[PDB]
């Protein structure tokens, strides 16, 4: 019924955020204040495409 296409492991590489949940929770309010635009663009892409493969960038 067709072949499922998946991104290569190189495509999925990124500089990860390796801070723990307490650090994230402490920073969360200012983080949502400052980094709103990329987060909202990603969430709109996510909820409009319904496909994780189309919103990697």
């Amino acid at each position: 019924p067709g072949i499922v296409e998946l991104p290569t492991l190189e495509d999925l590489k990124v500089q990860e955020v390796k801070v723990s949940s307490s650090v994230l929770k402490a920073a969360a309010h200012h983080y949502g204040a400052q980094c709103d635009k990329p987060n909202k663009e990603f969430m709109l892409c996510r909820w409009e495409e319904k496909d994780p493969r189309r919103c990697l960038e």
Partner: protein
């Protein structure tokens, strides 16, 4: 040659011996106890209202923290 000595009540008599019932009232009115209960309930209600409103605000704040972290 001595007097007759026997176990006898003292001259005069004995002091009165109580026998009747003694169950004193020793109680507040009904209105007093009912009023105290209602006042305690109202004080508790006011305190709990304040505390629960504050708790709702705190819950909203941490929910928004989750929302900020979600993407």
């Amino acid at each position: 040659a001595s007097k007759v000595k026997q176990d006898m009540p003292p001259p005069g008599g004995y002091g009165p011996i109580d026998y009747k019932r003694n169950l004193p009232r020793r109680g507040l009115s009904g209105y007093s106890m009912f009023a105290v209960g209602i006042g305690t309930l109202l004080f508790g209600y006011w305190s709990m209202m304040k505390w629960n409103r504050e708790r709702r605000r705190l819950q909203i704040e941490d929910f928004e923290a989750r929302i900020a972290l979600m993407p």
